[PDB]
A and B are shown apart, each in its own frame.
With several copies, the nearest count.
Chain A
Amino acid sequence: GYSDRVQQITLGNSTITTQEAANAVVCYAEWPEYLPDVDASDVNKTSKPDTSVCRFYTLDSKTWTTGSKGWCWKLPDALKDMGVFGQNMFFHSLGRSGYTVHVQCNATKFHSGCLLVVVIPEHQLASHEGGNVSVKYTFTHPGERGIDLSSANEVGGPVKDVLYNMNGTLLGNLLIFPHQFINLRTNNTATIVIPYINSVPIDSMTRHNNVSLMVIPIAPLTVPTGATPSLPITVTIAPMCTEFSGIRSKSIVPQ
């Protein structure tokens, strides 16, 4: 009586149940694991807070309306302030982590709409100015708020044009990245497990984000007659196999 459909994920002191899942994706078919010695470089023993950092943090909720263009969060940024995960983050020189991402959106059998939930490794954004204008730090570190693709261009911020993925590629091809759809008629959640993907064994958690999670409405939300025209979307994310190394004074970052 197991269905692909019902699932339970327990991680730390927190549990999620979905009764309307559509399997789960594990990026590149690899599950998060700690850093092996053969791959290690820094000689420091690392710190593995385990259950105090590897639990589920639910970010603040978004509201899908007929005019929504899509939202974008960066990792580990989105979690920069969650509990002890965040403290560890500002206090060590280097850290490394994988995540379980669970995006939630329920409706009824009269609604229609379909969101794309995708994880993009190394999502370098484009400046809407063109040329070689850079995208300032603050703009690519929105924190739990994430970036709202239907917000206005700002100065020093990225471009927010959806048919171009914020980088000069077409929305249609985002499907080459680990992703899952939430089609109100099928699905009510999306779950993706992200292994740590980098060109170095461990890195800085503040100067470099290693994935952007993106939720994009593709088939517009259509509510039943005289229904309220909107649904909330909630994102809950859990660091998994986290390791921190090179402890010290506590980083100070712009803004």
Chain B
Amino acid sequence: GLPTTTLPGSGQFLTTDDRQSPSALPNYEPTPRIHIPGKVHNLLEIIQVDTLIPMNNTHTKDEVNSYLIPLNANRQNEQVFGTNLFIGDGVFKTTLLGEIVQYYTHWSGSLRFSLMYTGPALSSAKLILAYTPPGARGPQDRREAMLGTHVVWDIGLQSTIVMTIPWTSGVQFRYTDPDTYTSAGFLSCWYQTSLILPPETTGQVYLLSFISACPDFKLRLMKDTQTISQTVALTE
């Protein structure tokens, strides 16, 4: 008989501990694995695939239309859309990125925001996208917007433009749930010159917008998502 002493914590059950256990089914042989395409190893692998952002959130019931950012022909100087960058809330929240970020407490890294244009091929347009780093207000006019991170996008044969929100930060991690100290800025978009439709054409054209994370990205300290809850256990 070897002398032992038990410490504080004996008998506790910590849902996060990782130890060995007896197998209830001694000697059982599991089914062989066969090959299946698509294996995922890290959630970091999947948040780099871009998905659509319901940017046009202004509706009243969920609709395919809140994915469409409208553009008006012949407007000059004006603003196309605006949003803050609380990736865990608001427009971002239902996107795959938003949806995964919510399983973690802290995030750090660059984001990739792209816009794909869908107007007739014989039209043309020049837009400016601007990222405003924390510390200033959402820009109120392009002059204000153009003094921060921006890209003049020229609509052409190449249909999409990929803007990166480079990680601009004092503190090396931000909270995924919106927090002030930790806030990330604003994203706005304005006409640089203006949309022009060809003859025989009319109305609004739309941009689709996507979001995905750069390879830069870090997420840490897992927790429970506000995105799902329940009141009684389900049954069959």
The chain A residues found within 8 Å of chain B, CB to CB, are 27-30, 36, 39, 109-114, 121, 132, 162-163, 170-173, 175-176, 181, 183-186, 195, 197-201, 218-219, 222, 224-226
Contact = CB atoms under 8 A, between A and B. Distances in A.
Interface stretch (B3-11, B203-211, B218-226): B203-211
B29 interface: no
Contact of B159 (A29, A185, A195): A185
B96 A218 contact: no
A163 B63 contact: yes
Given A175-B50, A175-B51, A224-B201, A218 B35 contact: no
B108 interface: no
A28 B35 CA distance: 13
A172 B117 contact: no
Contacts of B62: 163, 170
Given A110-B122, A171-B52, A175-B210, 14 more contacts: A27-B37, A111-B120, A113-B118, A114-B118, A132-B235, A171-B64, A172-B51, A175-B96, A185-B117, A185-B159, A197-B38, A218-B67, A219-B68, A224-B201
Contact of B37 (A28, A219, A224): A28
Contacts of B96: 173, 175-176
B194 interface: no
26 contacts: A27-B37, A27-B38, A28-B37, A28-B38, A30-B37, A109-B120, A110-B120, A110-B198, A112-B118, A113-B118, A132-B235, A132-B236, A163-B63, A163-B64, A171-B67, A172-B67, A175-B49, A175-B51, A183-B118, A185-B119, A186-B159, A197-B37, A197-B38, A218-B64, A222-B120, A224-B201
Given A181-B116, A222-B203, A109 B34 contact: no
Nearest to A175: B51
A32 to B, nearest CB: 10
B52 A172 contact: yes
B53 interface: yes
Nearest to B34: A39
Given A175-B210, A185-B117, A170 B201 contact: no
Contacts of A175: 49-52, 96, 210
Contacts of A185: 117-121, 159
A172 B46 contact: no
Nearest to B65: A220
A229 to B, nearest CB: 13
B34 to A, nearest CB: 4
Contacts of B120: 109-112, 184-185, 222, 224
Contacts of A30: 37
Contact of A225 (B63, B159, B202, B210): B202
Which 9 residue pairs across A and B have the least CB separation, nearest first? A28-B37, A109-B121, A172-B52, A219-B118, A185-B121, A28-B38, A30-B37, A39-B34, A175-B51
Interface in B150-205: 159, 198, 200-203, 205
B208 to A, nearest CB: 7
B94 interface: yes
A30 B37 CA distance: 7
A201 B34 contact: yes
Nearest to A202: B34
B24 interface: no
A173 B95 contact: yes
A219 B159 contact: no
B36 interface: yes
Contacts of A183: 116, 118, 159
B88 interface: no
Contacts of A181: 116
Contact of A176 (B37, B51, B200): B51
A109 to B, nearest CB: 4
A112 B119 contact: yes
Contacts of B159: 183, 185-186
B37 A195 contact: yes
